[PDB]
Amino acid sequence: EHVSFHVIQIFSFVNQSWARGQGSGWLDELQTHGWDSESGTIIFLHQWSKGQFSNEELSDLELLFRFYLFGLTREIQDHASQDYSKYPFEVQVKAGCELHSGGSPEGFFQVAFNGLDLLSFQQTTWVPSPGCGSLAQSVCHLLNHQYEGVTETVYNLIRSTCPRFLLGLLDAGKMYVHRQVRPEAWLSSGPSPGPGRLQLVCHVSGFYPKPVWVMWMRGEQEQQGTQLGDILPNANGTWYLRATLDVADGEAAGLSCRVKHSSLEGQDIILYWRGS
Amino acid sequence: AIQRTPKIQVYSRHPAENGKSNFLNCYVSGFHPSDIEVDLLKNGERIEKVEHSDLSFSKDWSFYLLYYTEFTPTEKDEYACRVNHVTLSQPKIVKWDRDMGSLV
Ligand SMILES: CCCCCCC[C@H](C)CCC[C@@H](C)CCC[C@@H](C)CCC[C@H](C)CCC[C@@H](C)CCCOP(=O)(O)C[C@@H]1O[C@H](CO)[C@@H](O)[C@H](O)[C@@H]1O
Ligand SMILES: CCCCCCCCCCCCCCCC(=O)OC[C@@H](O)CO
Ligand SMILES: *[C@@H]1O[C@H](CO)[C@@H](O)[C@H](O)[C@H]1NC(C)=O
Ligand SMILES: CCCCCCCCCCCC
């Protein structure tokens, strides 16, 4: 088991005078924080999104983030000179930490350029990705020598502040992050798989957490043709899964869809196909 | 460089029953760069009152967005998710199959 807190950023440089910066905070896959760019402030998305942090610590962090966003955008627009054949381009930052059962926390700070790994932070040092050549090395030189106080601040944030925050954030959100949410299911017919063939669809929606089991059945016999799709997100923290079955003409009667999930505990959902 | 093409999946939160309030989701994933236009449609027209998640991205750095809107299906009504992106010549309209959804 391990839990991650990610602060992500997206910097889209359109031209020499127009960049835009976006950012958010995520507890595993659950967004817990946004960033308001026109007022440059944190958006607390849940009542528990402040964790155990005081308003004072959060105000400090807010000022630090707004300084960071503006100064990074400005230094990049400065050092991208008049090379306006290089626009548009886009920088991504994924920073944060992970708590581990029985292990020490992990802290990370990873940067991408046009969707490729560019460089990362390694304890004390900015390290160019081997798969991004000259530019990576160039940026890392500057980061390693021109901006050393920024670097000690980054180290402290990802290795000390982030896991402390994440611990308090799990605790503040404990009644939510460990919720069990029961799904509903419904059946429909799908696109024809072929002449003399039918496709049955079992939709399972609204479950949390993500692990789920779904099979088409004839009585207690699981059906070979069962095919599960991807687990897809719903709004408000639940998930969706489609399970289909191709069946020959004149054999759909008596089939059912069976759903197991932690939230049911010995109350499998069983839905019978009613036609056709 | 390089650039990856959005994948578009459309599905309902609840069984598609005419006259029942529901939510229509469009999950757009795997694209790069982030500049994109995603619109939910009712009978061809952008749905003005929609929700979307903030921009996020996967471990491969490709972006994803979840769109959703409250909607009440009827028999006549047609719903879709339209997406434009630099990797796309024409805007791409993925029509919502009520029975199947529209996944890939
Ligand atoms: C943005 C998305 C938001 C999403 C919402 C998220 C909201 C949630 C609540 C977040 C809370 C979670 C948190 C606890 C976890 C944190 C983990 C992760 C964020 C690590 C990311 C590290 C940051 C981004 C990099 C910026 C560091 C640079 C900028 C250091 C600069 C300061 O350094 P400095 O003081 O040395 C310069 C000084 O400048 C002065 C003026 O010139 C001088 O006067 C002075 O003397 C100095 O020179
Ligand atoms: C004032 C502190 C705010 C926080 C921001 C600190 C990080 C600043 C990042 C600076 C951007 C560096 C751009 C480097 C571009 C460059 O100089 O390299 C060009 C190569 O292509 C030539 O070999
Ligand atoms: C940069 O892009 C912005 C956003 O489209 C635009 O408003 C502005 O005119 C552009 N600046 C130029 C081309 O100098
Ligand atoms: C094209 C100009 C360089 C873009 C890459 C700069 C990335 C800097 C990340 C520093 C994080 C604090």
Author numbering:
A (entry chain A): 6 to 281
B (entry chain B): 1 to 104
Quote the paper.
Whereas mice only express CD1d, humans express a functionally diverse family of CD1 antigen presenting molecules, namely CD1a, CD1b, CD1c, and CD1d. Here we focus on mycoketides, a class of mycobacterial lipids presented by CD1c. Certain T cell responses to MPM require both a phosphate and a β-linked mannose unit, which protrude from the ligand binding groove of CD1c. To determine the mechanism of epitope display, we determined binary crystal structures of CD1c-MPM-1, -MPM-2, and MPM-3 at 1.7, 2.0, and 2.1 Å, respectively.
The synthetic mycoketide lipid moiety was used here to generate three new MPM analogs with predicted chemical stability. These synthetic analogs comprise a carba-mannose, where the ring oxygen is replaced by a methylene group (MPM-1), and two C-mannosides, where the anomeric oxygen is replaced by a methylene group or a difluoro methylene moiety (MPM-2 and MPM-3, respectively). The lipid tails and phosphate of all three MPM analogs were anchored to the CD1c protein. Despite this, the mannose headgroup of all three MPM analogs showed considerable conformational flexibility. The phosphate group was sandwiched between a hydrophobic cluster including Leu69 and Phe72 of the α1 helix and Val155 and Thr158 of the α2 helix. The phosphate was unable to establish stabilizing interactions with CD1c, except for hydrogen bond formation with the Thr158 Oγ atom. This was observed in the MPM-1 and MPM-2 structures, which accounted for its reorientation within this region. We also observed a considerable movement of the CD1c α1 helix in the CD1c-MPM-1 and CD1c-MPM-2 structures compared with the CD1c-MPM-3 and native CD1c-MPM structures, with up to 2.1 Å difference at Leu74 Cα, which appears to be ligand-induced. MPM-2 and MPM-3 did not give rise to any detectable PM in either the stock solutions or the cell extracts. For MPM-2, we could not detect formation of PM, and the likely mechanism of recognition by DN6 is cross-reactive recognition of the intact compound. Therefore, we tested response of the CD8-1 T cell line to the stabilized MPM analogs. Both MPM-2 and MPM-3 elicited a response similar to nature-identical MPM, indicating that the chemical modification did not influence recognition by the TCR.
